[PDB]
């Protein structure tokens, strides 16, 4: 990016344009666009804790089908019975 001098001569007219492509800094970028999510993790009242998800949609109407992909910590498993209640 630097200044340059234009020199033109001869008959006729022509259109000269300059377009600069640059990577601009984002302003108030929201990494969680259209999906406000809130994960709350709490110790349970073998080591185990009660894991909670609170989710919401930023749109006007109720959202369409959504997916909650979960990749838990190392060496952790979900409680079977809780998934049983959540399945039906």
């Amino acid at each position: 990016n630097e200044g340059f001098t234009v020199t033109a001569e001869g008959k006729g007219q022509g259109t000269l344009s300059v377009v600069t492509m640059y990577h601009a800094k984002a302003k108030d970028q929201l990494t969680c666009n259209k999906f406000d999510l809130k994960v709350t993790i709490k110790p349970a009242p073998k080591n185990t804790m009660i894991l909670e998800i609170c989710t919401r949609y930023r749109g006007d109407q109720d959202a369409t089908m959504s997916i909650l992909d979960i990749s838990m910590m190392t060496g952790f498993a979900p409680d079977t019975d809780d998934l049983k209640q959540l399945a039906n």
Partner: protein, 107 residues
Amino acid sequence: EPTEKFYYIYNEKGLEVTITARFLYGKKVEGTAFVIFGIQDGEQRISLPESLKRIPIEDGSGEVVLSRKVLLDGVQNPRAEDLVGKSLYVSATVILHSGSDMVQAER
């Protein structure tokens, strides 16, 4: 791959869609699939929110059916002959049980 490359207007059974997903290296796949049927009229595309069906894919195979009632009620006009000359499209999204990635295949 639909069973027939068309949809008879009076077919009360309705359109039937067969999903056949396989790994690139010749192995079958397991996971879940998403199907939504949209009506295409030239450059104008109309979607059907009530046709969204969550079908589980087993051994790289699965099926889903669009009842004729859904097709009739999705468009505001209940007329039948007006639908002749239009087209349908299937936007299938397949997701592994591992959640690695999803592929949007459209016919």
